[PDB]
mmCIF file as Biopython writes it, N, C-alpha, C and O atoms, coordinates in Angstrom:
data_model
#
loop_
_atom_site.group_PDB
_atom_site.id
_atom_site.type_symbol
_atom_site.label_atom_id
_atom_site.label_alt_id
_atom_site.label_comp_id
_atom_site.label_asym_id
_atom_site.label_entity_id
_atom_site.label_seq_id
_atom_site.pdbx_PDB_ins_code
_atom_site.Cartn_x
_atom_site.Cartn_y
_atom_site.Cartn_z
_atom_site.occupancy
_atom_site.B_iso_or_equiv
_atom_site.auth_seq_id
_atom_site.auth_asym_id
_atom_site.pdbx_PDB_model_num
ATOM 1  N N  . UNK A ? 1 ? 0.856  -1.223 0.000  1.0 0.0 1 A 1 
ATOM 2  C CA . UNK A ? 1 ? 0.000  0.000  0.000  1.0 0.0 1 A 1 
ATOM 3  C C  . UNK A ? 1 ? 0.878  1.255  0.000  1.0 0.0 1 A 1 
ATOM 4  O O  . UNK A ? 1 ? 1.946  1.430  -0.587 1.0 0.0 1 A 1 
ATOM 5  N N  . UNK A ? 2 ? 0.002  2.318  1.004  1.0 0.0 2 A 1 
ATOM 6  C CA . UNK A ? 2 ? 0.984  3.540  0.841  1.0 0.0 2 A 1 
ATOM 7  C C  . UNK A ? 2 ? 0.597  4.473  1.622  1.0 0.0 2 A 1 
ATOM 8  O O  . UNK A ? 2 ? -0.606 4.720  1.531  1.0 0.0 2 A 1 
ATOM 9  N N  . UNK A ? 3 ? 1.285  5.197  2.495  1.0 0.0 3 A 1 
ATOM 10 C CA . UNK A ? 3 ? 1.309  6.263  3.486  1.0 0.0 3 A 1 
ATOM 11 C C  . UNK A ? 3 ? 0.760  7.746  3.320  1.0 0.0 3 A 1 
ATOM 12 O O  . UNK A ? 3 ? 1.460  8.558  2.715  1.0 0.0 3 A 1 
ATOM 13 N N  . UNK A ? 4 ? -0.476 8.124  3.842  1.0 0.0 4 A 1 
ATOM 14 C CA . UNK A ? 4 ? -1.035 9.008  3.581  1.0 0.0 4 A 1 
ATOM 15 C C  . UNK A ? 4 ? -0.402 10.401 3.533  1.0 0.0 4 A 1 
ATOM 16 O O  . UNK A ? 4 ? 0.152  10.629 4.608  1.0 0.0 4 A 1 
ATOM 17 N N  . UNK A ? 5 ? -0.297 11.345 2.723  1.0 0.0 5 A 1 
ATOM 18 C CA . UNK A ? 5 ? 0.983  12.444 2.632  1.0 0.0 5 A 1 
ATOM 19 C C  . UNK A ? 5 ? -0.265 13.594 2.663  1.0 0.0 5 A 1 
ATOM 20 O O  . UNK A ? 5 ? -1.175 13.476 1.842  1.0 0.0 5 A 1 
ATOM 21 N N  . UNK A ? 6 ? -0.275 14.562 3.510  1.0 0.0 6 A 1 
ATOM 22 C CA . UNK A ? 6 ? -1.326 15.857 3.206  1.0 0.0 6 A 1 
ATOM 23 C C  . UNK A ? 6 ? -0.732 16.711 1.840  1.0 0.0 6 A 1 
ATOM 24 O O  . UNK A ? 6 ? 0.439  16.981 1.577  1.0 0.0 6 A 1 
ATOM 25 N N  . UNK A ? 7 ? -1.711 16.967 1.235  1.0 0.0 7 A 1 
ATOM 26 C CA . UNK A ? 7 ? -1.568 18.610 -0.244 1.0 0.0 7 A 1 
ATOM 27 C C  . UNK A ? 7 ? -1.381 19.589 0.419  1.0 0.0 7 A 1 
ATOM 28 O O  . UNK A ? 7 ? -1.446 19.571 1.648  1.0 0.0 7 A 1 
ATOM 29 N N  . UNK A ? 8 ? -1.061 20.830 -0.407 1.0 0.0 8 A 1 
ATOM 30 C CA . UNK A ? 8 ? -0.533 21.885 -0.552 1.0 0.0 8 A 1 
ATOM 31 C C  . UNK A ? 8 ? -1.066 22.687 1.074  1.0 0.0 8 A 1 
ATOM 32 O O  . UNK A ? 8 ? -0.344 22.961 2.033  1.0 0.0 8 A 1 
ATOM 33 N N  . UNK A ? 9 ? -3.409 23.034 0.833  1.0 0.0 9 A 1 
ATOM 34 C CA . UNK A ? 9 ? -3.422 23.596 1.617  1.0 0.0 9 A 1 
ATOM 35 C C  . UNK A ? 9 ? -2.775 25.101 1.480  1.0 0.0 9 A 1 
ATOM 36 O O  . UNK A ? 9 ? -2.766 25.860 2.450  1.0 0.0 9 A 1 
#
């Protein structure tokens, strides 16, 4: 799977 990363914002 894969590790949730937050956007800009």
């Amino acid at each position: 799977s894969f590790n949730p990363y937050e956007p800009e914002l």
